[PDB]
Design an enzyme around this catalytic site. Structure first.
Site, short mmCIF file in Angstrom:
data_model
loop_
_atom_site.label_atom_id
_atom_site.label_comp_id
_atom_site.label_asym_id
_atom_site.label_seq_id
_atom_site.Cartn_x
_atom_site.Cartn_y
_atom_site.Cartn_z
N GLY C 10 40.85 93.90 69.62
CA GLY C 10 39.62 93.79 70.58
C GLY C 10 40.25 93.68 72.04
O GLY C 10 41.43 93.59 72.41
N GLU C 71 37.08 100.52 70.52
CA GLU C 71 36.61 101.69 71.52
C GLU C 71 37.77 101.88 72.25
O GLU C 71 38.68 100.87 72.42
CB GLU C 71 35.68 100.72 72.45
CG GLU C 71 35.54 101.25 73.91
CD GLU C 71 35.66 99.79 74.69
OE1 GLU C 71 36.16 98.86 74.22
OE2 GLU C 71 35.10 99.65 75.84
N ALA C 99 31.98 97.51 68.38
CA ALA C 99 31.24 96.75 67.17
C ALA C 99 29.79 96.11 68.01
O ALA C 99 29.11 95.52 67.26
CB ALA C 99 32.02 95.48 66.72
N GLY C 143 33.85 88.32 70.45
CA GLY C 143 33.57 89.87 70.40
C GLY C 143 33.28 90.13 69.17
O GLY C 143 33.54 89.48 68.03
N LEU C 252 59.78 77.20 65.55
CA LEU C 252 58.40 76.75 65.43
C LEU C 252 57.81 76.48 64.21
O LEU C 252 56.94 75.71 63.84
CB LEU C 252 57.42 78.21 66.09
CG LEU C 252 56.10 78.06 66.11
CD1 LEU C 252 55.54 77.04 67.00
CD2 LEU C 252 55.25 79.35 66.45
N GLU C 254 59.38 74.73 62.22
CA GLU C 254 59.78 73.42 61.90
C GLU C 254 58.36 72.62 62.89
O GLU C 254 58.10 71.55 61.88
CB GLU C 254 61.12 72.95 62.60
CG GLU C 254 61.84 71.94 62.26
CD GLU C 254 63.12 71.78 62.29
OE1 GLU C 254 63.96 72.62 61.76
OE2 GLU C 254 63.91 70.96 63.11
N1 LIG Z 1 40.92 85.10 78.29
C1 LIG Z 1 40.21 86.13 78.19
N2 LIG Z 1 39.28 86.43 77.39
C2 LIG Z 1 38.63 87.56 77.09
C3 LIG Z 1 39.28 88.59 77.56
N3 LIG Z 1 38.66 89.75 77.43
C4 LIG Z 1 37.21 89.25 76.72
N4 LIG Z 1 37.68 87.93 76.71
C5 LIG Z 1 36.65 87.13 75.93
O1 LIG Z 1 36.21 87.60 74.63
C6 LIG Z 1 34.74 87.49 74.35
C7 LIG Z 1 34.12 88.88 74.08
O2 LIG Z 1 35.04 89.43 73.15
P1 LIG Z 1 35.72 90.68 73.40
O3 LIG Z 1 37.12 90.81 73.15
O4 LIG Z 1 35.78 91.17 74.75
O5 LIG Z 1 35.07 92.16 72.61
P2 LIG Z 1 36.04 92.90 71.39
O6 LIG Z 1 36.90 92.19 70.63
O7 LIG Z 1 36.30 94.02 72.15
O8 LIG Z 1 34.49 93.48 70.48
P3 LIG Z 1 33.45 94.33 70.93
O9 LIG Z 1 33.51 94.94 72.12
O10 LIG Z 1 32.10 94.02 70.68
O11 LIG Z 1 33.52 95.62 69.88
C8 LIG Z 1 34.07 86.66 75.58
O12 LIG Z 1 34.19 85.44 75.43
C9 LIG Z 1 35.05 86.99 76.73
O13 LIG Z 1 35.23 85.89 77.67
C10 LIG Z 1 40.29 88.62 78.33
O14 LIG Z 1 41.17 89.57 78.80
N5 LIG Z 1 41.17 87.33 78.54
MG LIG Z 2 35.04 94.94 74.13
#
Ligand SMILES: Nc1nc2c(ncn2[C@@H]2O[C@H](COP(=O)(O)OP(=O)(O)OP(=O)(O)O)[C@@H](O)[C@H]2O)c(=O)[nH]1
Ligand SMILES: [Mg+2]
Ligand SMILES: Nc1nc2c(ncn2[C@@H]2O[C@H](COP(=O)(O)OP(=O)(O)O)[C@@H](O)[C@H]2O)c(=O)[nH]1
Ligand SMILES: [Ca+2]
Ligand SMILES: [Mg+2]
Lengths: 67, 421, 440
Positions: C10, C71, C99, C143, C252, C254
């Site tokens: 993701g 994506e 998703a 996500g 790690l 350990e």
């Molecule tokens: N720390 C951090 N959190 C992230 C980042 N990108 C997205 N998030 C967090 O991820 C969550 C949303 O999920 P995503 O990872 O963006 O979405 P995805 O895994 O691509 O899933 P879909 O887009 O629905 O297909 C939110 O809580 C965001 O704050 C990042 O680059 N760094």
């Molecule tokens: Mg996404």
């Protein structure tokens, strides 16, 4: 002692094999149950629209009754 | 990338759809000949969401123009950007619906519905990853109301796993074309409840009231009303057209805005009509809503807010967080963090800063109570029913659509009074 | 030998992977084209950094990594970015439509179309390993891909790799930077599904990292780049024992022996220091005693919880840079008096210490200052259950009205999966209460 040592290593093998087996079957049941569920939702949706077309035919045949 | 197919049907549909394509082509820097002449690469990053790229690097809108009478679509082809549209995407009727839902949904529209589906099928078949469909129409006429809702149902049959989005125009006696408009609206709302994923309620009563009370005109033309619609339609699609993380596509917008499938009718809002606090406060004001409802008369299920322009994105976070706390009792508790805020550095034309409000409020029931009260007062006497029963309809279809709408309002009231704790 | 394969799932996992692999290259002296002039063994070797980097004949050091997203938008930035030459195209796997913030689409509808390809590519990485140690899975809780596809992947990895170790770096959702309203749903669903398939999971609360950037780095509105560069420092501290070597370098695994007293209690609390700006670092040097003291300040924790409200079952200090044991023991001796650190009665109270002499580094142009010594603390405290509790309460608020559940049921899921997942969380909350109760 030698017999127990083989019992332990075979029990460790049996434990890992069984964890993989259960994981493999839980996953297959989930994916199949989900696939059937989604197809049932789409089938129910398209059938509901199928009734829309039949009622539209009823409307056109009802108007056609001029005499 | 993620293509959206646009459809406009009837007078109101093709009119506001024209202004929409005029505005966003201007924002993405596309001339009437379909050529790019912009400065920012952000104008072309997600240009393919609404446009195709043909020979000679021309950008053609992925739009289909539909109507049961040619008079409305002819001035669209003759207007500005009339060359930008694919001439084969014009689907033309020669009979008209006579502002009758039955003619649009069953008789005149059903004869022309197949030719529209063929054009829609060609635009979708050449899509890399189709998002869904975006419809502009009115609910008080015949073509856009009857044939529009028919077009929605027939498209859902062929694309059941795509998002169906509509910009529906609600009729009001303050700009009433005909008298049977409560009939067409109630029958169409019954269809929009079952077959669309998200519907923006563009209420002509709210448009006229803004064009009268706020912007002083007294004699507001359709151009002044549609000017509000273009700015609104440009605002609610900014997340679709530019590089953004929040509500970037139709399905993510529907997932975050629609907590229950039938409650998918939104209250659009626009500001201004000078600073980030002032911009935030006007955006939530009942007098800036494009629907004739007062949100302080209901509860917010979900809200999306788009700030456009250049401004302190830290001050935006502090202002959007401040209004949620001060107005805490107007947001349902059982949906945490139900207000999303987007920022786009590219402002609209003529404005240094703007704000676009999309709310899913239970107060939308006021709009549906207004249309239902005009329906029942007209249905109590069985007025003008020969227009519809002459087309083969039965009184059951009227009573059902009314009973369906009364269930929608009671569903909004059910969740307005729902609590936690 | 002892190779580790990283899997970034993701947007959050991919973008964090970019920060980690950029930081790794800077720590090891690997150029964006994969060349490493210090590595005198061309085309291979068994140096410590080879646990994360394979080697081609042309001298390119290739991450043992796979990037997966449903994506293309995010991974396309890896493909055209600064370290594009670092990866082979087969390590960058993309779908067409994501998703849509929906666990069901990540785990089922969209996920099943790409899971076999992802496993095939993981298998090609494992076949290059002389003794694969396990996997590191980076993903978000919130996500649709980070939750749904990760659960599907962890289940498939249990099948294809037995009980080989799987570690998680998971992004706990925060409203300040959240994407979707249904993030509590996806979080509970994936935590439930992954629970029995994960040996160890390092949660990272975006609100904790967000507040650390605002306070310590003076960033008015931190971005994902700000958060991920900080997160990469914690990941670097945790994996430095695998990637580097030393007389006082404690592995790690350990630490993992001390950190996981029961299979389900496998969520360590991470605390990192020092996080300071260049302006403050120009003024003062932070000693071993100062950075150790900062490890017990709740403001420096990766997850918002109150360790005073819980009990300790383990406490590990991972030092890197200019640090010697005499300083550590003296500083720990101070902390063991000025701070009250309550252990459960069934666990020894000592601190487990590791030192990595390789000095920490930072991305040039970043906001983190380069310091001479840093420390990451990994503690197992029952207080981390507070993070589950907050998340569970948001789940319960929405699920009582079945809000948004139709988006999940429409994709083939059942209400039973929600209630079953929530019950697992209630049992996990009960588990954390039980482990902290004194013996009879
Ligand atoms: N720390 C951090 N959190 C992230 C980042 N990108 C997205 N998030 C967090 O991820 C969550 C949303 O999920 P995503 O990872 O963006 O979405 P995805 O895994 O691509 O899933 P879909 O887009 O629905 O297909 C939110 O809580 C965001 O704050 C990042 O680059 N760094
Ligand atoms: Mg996404
Ligand atoms: N805002 C707006 N409303 C319109 C416009 N044209 C028509 N309407 C409204 O639409 C309703 C009539 O629908 P109509 O467009 O005639 O349907 P059609 O003839 O089938 O295309 C009336 O209540 C009008 O108020 C327009 O350009 N802008
Ligand atoms: Ca080598
Ligand atoms: Mg008209």
């Amino acid at each position: 002692k030698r017999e127990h040592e083989r019992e332990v290593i075979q029990k460790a093998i049996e434990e890992n094999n069984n964890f993989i087996k259960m994981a493999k079957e839980k996953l297959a049941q989930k994916m199949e149950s989900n696939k059937e569920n989604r197809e049932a939702h789409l089938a129910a949706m398209l059938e509901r629209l199928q009734e829309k077309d039949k009622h539209a035919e009823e409307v056109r045949k009802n108007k056609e009754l001029k005499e | 990338m993620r293509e959206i197919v646009h459809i406009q049907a009837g007078q109101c549909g093709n009119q506001i759809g024209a202004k929409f394509w005029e505005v966003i082509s201007d924002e993405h820097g596309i001339d009437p000949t379909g050529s790019y002449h912009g400065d920012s690469d952000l104008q072309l990053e997600r240009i393919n969401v609404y446009y195709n790229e043909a020979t000679g690097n021309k950008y053609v809108p992925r739009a289909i123009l539909v109507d049961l009478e040619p008079g409305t679509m002819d001035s669209v082809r003759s207007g500005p950007f009339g060359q930008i549209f694919r001439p084969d995407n014009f689907v033309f009727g020669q009979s008209g619906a006579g502002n009758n839902w039955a003619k649009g949904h069953y008789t005149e529209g059903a004869e022309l519905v197949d030719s529209v589906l063929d054009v829609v099928r060609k635009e979708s078949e050449s899509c890399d990853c189709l998002q869904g469909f975006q419809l502009t129409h009115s609910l008080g006429g015949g073509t856009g109301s009857g044939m529009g809702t028919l077009l929605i149902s027939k498209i859902r049959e062929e694309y059941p796993d795509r998002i169906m989005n509509t910009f529906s125009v609600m009729p009001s006696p303050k700009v009433s074309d005909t008298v049977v408009e409560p009939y067409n609206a109630t029958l169409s709302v019954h269809q929009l409840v079952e077959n669309t994923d998200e519907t923006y309620c563009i209420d002509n009563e709210a448009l006229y009231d803004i064009c009268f009370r706020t912007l002083k005109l007294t004699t507001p033309t359709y151009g002044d009303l549609n000017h509000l619609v273009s700015a609104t339609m440009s605002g609610v699609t900014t997340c679709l057209r530019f590089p953004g993380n929040l509500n970037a596509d139709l399905r993510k917008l529907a997932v975050n805005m629609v907590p229950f499938p039938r409650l998918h009718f939104f209250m659009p809002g626009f500001a201004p009509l000078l600073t980030v606090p002032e911009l935030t406060q006007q955006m939530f004001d009942s007098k800036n809503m494009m629907a004739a409802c007062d949100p302080r008369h209901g509860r917010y299920l979900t809200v999306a807010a788009i700030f456009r322009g250049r401004m302190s994105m830290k001050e935006v976070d502090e202002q959007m967080l401040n209004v949620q706390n001060k107005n805490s009792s107007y947001f349902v508790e059982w949906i945490p963090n139900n207000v999303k805020t987007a920022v786009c550095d590219i402002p609209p034309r003529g404005l240094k800063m703007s704000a676009t409000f999309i709310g899913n409020s239970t107060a939308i029931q006021e709009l549906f109570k207004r249309i239902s009260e005009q329906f029942t007062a007209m249905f109590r006497r069985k007025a003008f029913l020969h227009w519809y029963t002459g087309e083969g309809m039965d009184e059951m279809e009227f009573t059902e659509a009314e009973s369906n709408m009364n269930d929608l309002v009671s569903e909004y009231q059910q969740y307005q009074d729902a609590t936690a704790d | 030998m002892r190779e580790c394969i990283s899997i970034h799932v993701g947007q959050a996992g991919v973008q964090i992977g970019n920060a980690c692999w950029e930081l790794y290259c800077l720590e090891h002296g690997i150029q964006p084209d994969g060349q490493m002039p210090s590595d005198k063994t061309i085309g291979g070797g068994d140096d410590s950094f080879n646990t994360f980097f394979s080697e081609t004949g042309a001298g390119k050091h290739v991450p043992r990594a796979v990037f997966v997203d449903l994506e293309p938008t995010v991974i396309d930035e890896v493909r055209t970015g600064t370290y594009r030459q670092l990866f082979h195209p087969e390590q960058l796997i993309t779908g067409k439509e994501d998703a849509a913030n929906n666990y069901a689409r990540g785990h089922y509808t969209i996920g099943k179309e790409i899971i076999d390809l992802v496993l095939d590519r993981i298998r090609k990485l494992a076949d290059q390993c002389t003794g694969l140690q396990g996997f590191l899975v980076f993903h978000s809780f919130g996500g649709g891909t980070g939750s749904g596809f990760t659960s599907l992947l962890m289940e498939r990895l249990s099948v294809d790799y037995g009980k080989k170790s799987k570690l998680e770096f998971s992004i706990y959702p925060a409203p300040q930077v959240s994407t979707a309203v249904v993030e509590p749903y996806n979080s509970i669903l994936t935590t439930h599904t992954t629970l029995e398939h994960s040996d160890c999971a390092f949660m990272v609360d975006n609100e904790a990292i967000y507040d650390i950037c605002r306070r310590n780095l003076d960033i008015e509105r931190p971005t994902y780049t700000n958060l991920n560069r900080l997160i990469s420092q914690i990941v670097s501290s945790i994996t430095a024992s695998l990637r580097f070597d030393g007389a006082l370098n404690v592995d790690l695994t350990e630490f993992q022996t001390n950190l996981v007293p029961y299979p389900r209690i496998h969520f360590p609390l991470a605390t990192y220091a020092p996080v300071i700006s260049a302006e403050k670092a120009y003024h003062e040097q932070l000693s071993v005693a100062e950075i150790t003291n900062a490890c017990f300040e709740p403001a420096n924790q990766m997850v918002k919880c109150d360790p005073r409200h819980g009990k300790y079952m383990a406490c590990c200090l991972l030092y890197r840079g200019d640090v010697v044991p005499k300083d550590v023991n003296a500083a720990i001796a101070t902390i063991k008096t000025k701070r009250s650190i309550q252990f459960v009665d069934w666990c020894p109270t000592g601190f487990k210490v590791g030192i990595n002499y390789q000095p920490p580094t930072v991305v040039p142009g970043g906001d983190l200052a380069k310091v001479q010594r840093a420390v990451c603390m990994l503690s197992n405290t029952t207080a981390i259950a507070e993070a589950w509790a907050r998340l569970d309460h948001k789940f319960d608020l929405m699920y009582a009205k079945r809000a948004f559940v139709h988006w999940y049921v429409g994709e083939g899921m059942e209400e039973g999966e929600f209630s079953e997942a929530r019950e697992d969380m209630a049992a996990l909350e009960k588990d954390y209460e039980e482990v902290g109760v004194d013996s009879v």
